[PDB]
């Protein structure tokens, strides 16, 4: 019960999935021409999770990438490693979803998705130990928010016993690429909360801030950000695919980290956040990774942690680590950071140990937690709606297809309910 099928959709989702693919093929070791490079055994049975054995000792991915623009796959098969992708994995159409929610999946997005569901079924009986479903998409993007939720609907319909993992990128409330980006984001979360079991809060501006703070990056490139998020995504499952003291699974995240399926929003933090030029001057140890974990400028929600409080926090450690260091540092943080932990657990902690070291580093970890700071982003988006959308400007583009104000009022009620849940559970 380990195999994972990686679903990719949206403009940003394709890049994130591709970068995740190069990170995977580099962390376990596999050249693009079909040459075995695992060392020695543990890197062979665990690659069945993402790849399947083809003829002549060839390994090919089991991943359905879907997008209405076919220009991204050209920059995948001829670019860096995507040559393993079988031609049937390319499900693309013409020409775009319109960068909106009314045309994303309501009328035209429901045509080829039947074939998508059929190929998902055929991969399902082609798979033996299907475990989870990984989706990468954009919350405000037309394609990702458009058919992503409807794919979630089908994957719930056909698999009532399989949980769903979503990693949508949340647009910042201060950057507006288009006037209807938060509109599409909220029209997507209208069904995301009713169809998903857990999700991660990803903000590009937080990535820019961490690049200009620690990385000192001069050129704003989405490739480095994809590399970082893909390293985080690999790290959250290294515990499952590499045994340790306590292996962690997505269902274990649902049981422990999630307080109830209604509240499933998480902020992501990664460590170590070091760049070239500081590698010969730091000692990479568990305590340093810990102060980098609870540092207020290291998560990518991105909100303020010490102005609110946490509800439950988790640690997913990687590499050769002793049991005493991590628990001693956890005693230290529980002693000094006791005020911001909830007074009913009372020890907000979930630990997981990974054996192999991260690629390009020695010791690393990921941060998953629940705080009361996401309701601030929700009320910011709601206030943006209550300000801009009361004029009913450019709103006919969606009501032309049969949209009613009842759906928007229900979404506002949903975000009010989410805020109230974030206040139960007071800040």
């Amino acid at each position: 019960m380990r195999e994972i099928i990686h679903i990719s959709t949206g403009q940003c989702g394709n890049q994130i999935g591709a970068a995740f693919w190069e990170t995977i093929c580099g962390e376990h070791g596999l050249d693009f021409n079909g040459t075995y490079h695992g060392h020695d055994d543990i890197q062979k049975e665990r690659l069945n999770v993402y790849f399947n054995e083809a003829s002549s000792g060839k390994w090919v991915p089991r991943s359905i990438n879907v997008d209405l623009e076919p220009g991204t796959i050209d920059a995948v098969r001829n670019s860096a490693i995507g040559n393993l992708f079988r031609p049937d994995n390319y499900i693309f159409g013409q020409s775009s979803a319109g960068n909106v929610w009314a045309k994303g999946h309501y009328t035209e997005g429901a045509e080829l998705v039947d074939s998508v569901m059929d190929v998902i079924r055929r991969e399902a009986e082609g798979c033996d130990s299907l475990q989870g479903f990984q989706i990468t998409h954009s919350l405000g993007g037309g394609t990702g928010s458009g058919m992503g939720t409807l794919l979630i609907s089908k994957i719930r319909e056909e698999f009532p016993d399989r949980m769903m993992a979503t990693f949508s990128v949340l647009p910042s409330p201060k950057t507006s690429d288009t006037v209807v980006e938060p509109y599409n984001a909220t029209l997507s979360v209208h069904q995301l909360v009713e169809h998903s079991d857990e999700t991660f809060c990803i903000d590009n501006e937080a990535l820019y801030d961490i690049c200009q703070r620690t990385l000192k990056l001069n050129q704003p490139s989405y490739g480095d950000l994809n590399n970082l998020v893909s390293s985080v995504m690999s790290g959250v499952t290294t515990s499952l695919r590499y045994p340790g003291q306590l292996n962690s699974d997505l269902r274990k995240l649902a049981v422990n980290l999630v307080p109830f399926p209604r509240l499933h929003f998480f902020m992501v933090g990664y460590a170590p956040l070091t760049a070239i030029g500081s590698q010969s001057f730091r000692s990479l140890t568990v305590p340093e990774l810990t102060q980098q974990m609870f540092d207020a400028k290291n998560m990518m929600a991105a909100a303020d942690p010490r102005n609110g409080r946490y509800l439950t926090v988790a640690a997913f450690f990687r590499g050769k680590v002793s049991v005493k260091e991590v628990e001693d540092e956890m005693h230290k943080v529980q002693s000094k950071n006791s005020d911001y932990f909830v007074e009913w657990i009372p020890n907000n902690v979930q630990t997981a140990v990974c054996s192999v070291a991260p690629q390009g580093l020695d010791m690393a970890a990921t941060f998953i937690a629940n705080s009361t700071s996401i309701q601030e982003l929700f009320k910011r988006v709601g206030d943006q709606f209550s300000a801009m959308f009361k004029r009913k400007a450019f709103l006919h583009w969606y009501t032309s297809e049969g949209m009613d104000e009842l759906e928007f009022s229900e979404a506002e009620s949903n975000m009010n309910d989410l805020v109230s849940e974030y206040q139960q559970y007071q800040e």
Binding site: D249, R251, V255, F260, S322, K324, W344, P346, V349, Q350
Partner: protein, 440 residues
Amino acid sequence: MREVISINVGQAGCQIGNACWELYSLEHGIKPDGHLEDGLSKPKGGEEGFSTFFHETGYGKFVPRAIYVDLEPNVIDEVRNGPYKDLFHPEQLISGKEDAANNYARGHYTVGREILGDVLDRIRKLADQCDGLQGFLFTHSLGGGTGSGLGSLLLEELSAEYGKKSKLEFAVYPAPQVSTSVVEPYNTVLTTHTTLEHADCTFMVDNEAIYDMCKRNLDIPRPSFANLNNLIAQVVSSVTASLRFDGSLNVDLNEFQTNLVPYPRIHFPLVSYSPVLSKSKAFHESNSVSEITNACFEPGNQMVKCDPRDGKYMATCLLYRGDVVTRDVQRAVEQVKNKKTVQLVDWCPTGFKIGICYEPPTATPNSQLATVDRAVCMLSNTTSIAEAWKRIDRKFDLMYAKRAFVHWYVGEGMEEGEFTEAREDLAALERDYIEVGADS
């Protein structure tokens, strides 16, 4: 009434078992693959025992009789890819392939009992393989839900099938300071009722105390789980001291429940092992049994985060290995009584079970415990863990105010009545703990 069957559940229990069979191979002279290499004694089997834990193959091989049940195949693969493959029968290694929780969410429910039939059939076949049956050994972690759930299910199953064999459970308790996962207290207490109704003798071990003694006594800056496994492996294998080696006054397994447990009531004795010293401190200490007993009475060596000297006296057993003198130990215990220790009860009124074993104490080369000419294993059903369950129960009350988990717990089929019943059972157990010493 000859053989003892050991079952390990959970990753921690599997590690403890691996360590303990490594030791068993060490003192009894079995190579890490078996057959032989070579046989030593006289007495190690023949004459019996063995066989007591290792099956005596007709070809001359030695096969441990253990069943590895777990739903996480990684532990079974780690056992099978190492030197342990030549010790365990292929059918005895029950490898699981279903992972949905770790594990008490579904372990103690209908999800586990369609596999329990095969486990019961296998253990019945193994019992029919050997001549007679004496008792069972349990090694599971109450933190990991796999151990709690599956071990408890096996407990009721094998209490139903025989109901006449001794039940020894070495359960790893979650650290009372902090818990590695939040659901561990549920995994412990929702099975404490089954343990109360379906156990004969339970041993409590705490990882925090082992780490404390590793930091202090062993002077190890970074203790490892392997060191804990080795230490509790000697603790288990010295019980289990006269059952495999000759002694002037051997101790029987039934004797423990005849003397320590005179009621249908509390049967949960503590354990302690001493002396505990490193290889560098063996050039300065040659103490007698009195100081070893004093170290046993120390809270740090009791494997419980409490004060055993603040409790009330209960019947205890003293097991001695190596070169010991009965007059010396009588003098030591009389001095301990003179120091006005834990309040003696009027029902025994003073009972000190003394066990003498000829074999010298043994230590693991993988551990930093120096070999000593005399060691003490002390077993006592002291009421000093009552405040430990009280602290766990206060945690229970504070995290049961919101109940925090009843969503999934009810969704799978349970309800708050079971939690309330476990709460009142724990309260009754604490009240009995107070009363059994308050009567005197």
